[PDB]
Amino acid sequence: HHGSLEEKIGCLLKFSGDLDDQTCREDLHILFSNHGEIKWIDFVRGAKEGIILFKEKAKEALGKAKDANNGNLQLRNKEVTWEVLEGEVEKEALKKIIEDQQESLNKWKSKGR
């Protein structure tokens, strides 16, 4: 056989711990470059952590960059540690991340299509 079809996607990772309030996503998103760039970050006001899906794979850039040292990646290089959730928990956040960005971008047309 030699073939994998189990179907297990997970391009979103989350981090929790010391979180900053002024830092910006542009600064941390650039740090994950050269090893998985960030595609989007969803943080809830008053939350204790945050999730970030990458353009190539959060589990890849997060577990790869998270592994670069101890195995837990910190956010902003000294703030929150991120770890990929499970198929059930990783997906629950993946869907919420889409609904959050869909409302942040908004659409102006009403023409149809």
- CATH of residue 72's domain is 3.30.70.330
Distance, CA of 93 to CA of 12 (rounded, Å): 8
CA separation (Å) from 33 to 7, 21, 48, 85? 27, 22, 25, 22
Q: CA 31 to CA 75: how far, in whole Å?
A: 10
Q: Is 107 helix (H, G, I), strand (E, B) or coil?
A: coil
* Structural domain containing residue 54: 1-113
Question: How many domains does the chain fold into?
Answer: 1
How far apart are the C-alpha atoms of 21 and 46, rounded to whole Å?
10
> 2: which 2 tokens?
């030699």
Distances (CA, A) of 56 to 6, 7, 78, 90, 95: 20, 17, 23, 16, 17
